[PDB]
Design an enzyme around this catalytic site. Sequence first.
Site, short mmCIF file in Angstrom:
data_model
loop_
_atom_site.label_atom_id
_atom_site.label_comp_id
_atom_site.label_asym_id
_atom_site.label_seq_id
_atom_site.Cartn_x
_atom_site.Cartn_y
_atom_site.Cartn_z
N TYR A 128 41.10 40.65 51.08
CA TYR A 128 40.40 39.39 50.86
C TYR A 128 41.01 38.26 51.68
CZ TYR A 128 39.32 35.13 48.11
OH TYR A 128 38.95 33.87 47.70
N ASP A 213 45.18 42.82 41.37
CA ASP A 213 44.09 41.87 41.21
C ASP A 213 42.87 42.70 40.82
OD1 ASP A 213 41.90 40.18 41.57
OD2 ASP A 213 42.76 39.16 43.31
N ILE A 215 39.99 41.62 39.44
CA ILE A 215 38.83 40.76 39.27
C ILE A 215 37.49 41.51 39.32
CG2 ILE A 215 38.70 40.11 41.72
CD1 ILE A 215 37.95 37.27 40.87
N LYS A 249 33.50 37.01 39.19
CA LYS A 249 32.72 38.03 39.92
C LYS A 249 31.90 38.94 39.00
CE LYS A 249 34.40 36.30 43.77
NZ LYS A 249 35.67 36.85 44.33
#
EC number: 1.4.-.-
Lengths: 409, 409
Positions: A128, A213, A215, A249
């Site tokens: 990312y 992470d 998410i 998200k």
Amino acid sequence: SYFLGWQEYEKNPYHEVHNTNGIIQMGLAENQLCFDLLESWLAKNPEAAAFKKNGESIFAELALFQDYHGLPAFKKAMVDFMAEIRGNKVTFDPNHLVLTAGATSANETFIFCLADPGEAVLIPTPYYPGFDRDLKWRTGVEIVPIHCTSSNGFQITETALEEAYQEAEKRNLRVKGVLVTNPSNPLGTTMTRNELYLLLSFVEDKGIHLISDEIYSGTAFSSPSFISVMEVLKDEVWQRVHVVYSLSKDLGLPGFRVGAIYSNDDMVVAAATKMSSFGLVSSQTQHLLSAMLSDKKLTKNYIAENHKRLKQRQKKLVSGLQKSGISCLNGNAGLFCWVDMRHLLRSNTFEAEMELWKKIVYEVHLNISPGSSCHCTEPGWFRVCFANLPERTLDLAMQRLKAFVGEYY
Amino acid sequence: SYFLGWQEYEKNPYHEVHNTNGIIQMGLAENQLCFDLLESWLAKNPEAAAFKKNGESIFAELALFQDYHGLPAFKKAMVDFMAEIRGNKVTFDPNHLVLTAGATSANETFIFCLADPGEAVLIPTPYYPGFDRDLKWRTGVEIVPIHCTSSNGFQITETALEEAYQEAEKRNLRVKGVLVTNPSNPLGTTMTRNELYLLLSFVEDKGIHLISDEIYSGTAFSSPSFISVMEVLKDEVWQRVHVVYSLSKDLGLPGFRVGAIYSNDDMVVAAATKMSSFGLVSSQTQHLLSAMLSDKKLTKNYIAENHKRLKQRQKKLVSGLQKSGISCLNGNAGLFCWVDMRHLLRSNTFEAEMELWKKIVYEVHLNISPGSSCHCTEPGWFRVCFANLPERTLDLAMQRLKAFVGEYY
């Protein structure tokens, strides 16, 4: 520059009934697929948004609520939701959860807690692009890449981990941890059990931290199964494994800024809690989402429908790309596909990748992300998002691309 | 430690109908005086809290709104409110306003923008103890005090500024700016025009920045007049003067985390805007407060009534203290008084101050703030808050204190 696609989108954005020839946005990981479920819930349950609980106003109580431990009811709803996402295979202590203003805030805070200026964290590529700011800008911490390649589906290998550690040494950097994204942005794949075991073995050996992470954890919509780093922990190092989460998200609520840090280390929890003072979640928003996430009918139906709808859109993108002779990395999660356009490059170079990318922006009028923006070591990969467009607009984008491929190739 | 009063309050908090002998909270700058005005407005105007505008749902639009420039309607309402607080004597460009998650976030972000690790900012003492964390913890920046004394009502002098600058030099620190609180926490006084001119002359001479934390700007309830640093600018250095603001203390909304940076320097605005990504304001909250602050009838009445009610409470505290033979620094703003208890010290030492403070916690069961916690150089001053209690509870606190003074003195 990598901002060219966005610059052109802002100047000439697509609109089906005003600007049909405009640029279609497929470069932003945004989930617009399930808002009807949330709007329907809000219509049926107007109390929390109205600052009422049991018919009494709680406006003043919320207005005054600035405690950096977070609203207890909301932290309980959050850990319950995190368990539910993981099929109730793992549970989270709400006292070990720290709320932050988005995962953006959570990731920066983790770096401040775990690494000093001039030290480093390892990150698998592609990754990312936001991390180049979030993890480095105010922290003085460096990123050293763990390079992944298409040969094995962009999976982390023991060799790549060791190579990263030795690059850090060459750069005179002390490594403090590894940060992974599971499921991956931009790959759209869930981490494998073998990768998780490799990562755990590695950080055990090196005496460093592992931050996962997660998410995208609620967006795994096809086999193989999502495996949270916390699940593999069930089957010393335990204190050094941590999770980042957010509602941006899965629920599509990035504007509300709901992020979370989870750590098994009491001292990390304490430090992150204190740091959260710089980026607390609005108590208005905590209250609303505590009501929403406490509704087990909503959470169950939301996850189920989000999986259904995400899968349908990913399949549509994959099928549309196939008709232009374009394959994707076989994925099963996220809001995007990782798309193989190597065969459309003038040559195997990033210069060629950027040439192709600019043609797609200017001639096809699509905004997508070139893989070099995510630090992919192989030219010609692109991230293409699918969860923000109406199905007809996605179809239009695929039609445009096919015409482009037919003409120049 | 300075946390003793809070520790005891948490263990034994006062309650008029359950724990009448408990500790009364007068150590937290919290404004509970005007919630009825906001609740009444919400009752009359239920749309914004309901995610509706013009009868249409805007839930999805807000859920997706994550732009670090902030919601345009909200930034417009904010600058209008800031002008109104200042009697429309100054206006603010909303493009130069940056929203942050509270003034806590704004102040830290300013330091990151203006100073590098190992550099320093000057702060008049006594000051808000939160600054020791906010300005220093993650920034690596040091604070050098500008000492103010009671002899001239704790005003900044040219001598004190020069002494601070030379302390910084002795400490081998490069000074990057001065941060002031106007009106002052904990003094409860508005900065004077002469002080503002002295500060402007000083930062001009030294080539440094002036940051004015004007979070209490809307709480000036008696003469002399509040003067914003931006007003004195009307009558090079212009680019180096900046303002911090928040809705936490005037509107009493600390839980909502609404802070703001204002700067005349385009580059500071740009940097702070990017940094705000780590602490954005919830779009749900931005929308609600844009509706509230756009109502000019509400803002006018709110400021007027807040002034009225704050003045009435300050007068009650001052009068109550007078009956125990205790004077205050003559103040006119804020949520607290700066109280002179020097004559109640065993000796002119901070040890004596702490002895007295602990007696007040344990024997009088009041939580107040010892001046040494605010870095006051004179032992025996205390900050006492008045805006969070019912009038009867304030009266009870004054009764308890009088009995204490009568007994031991």
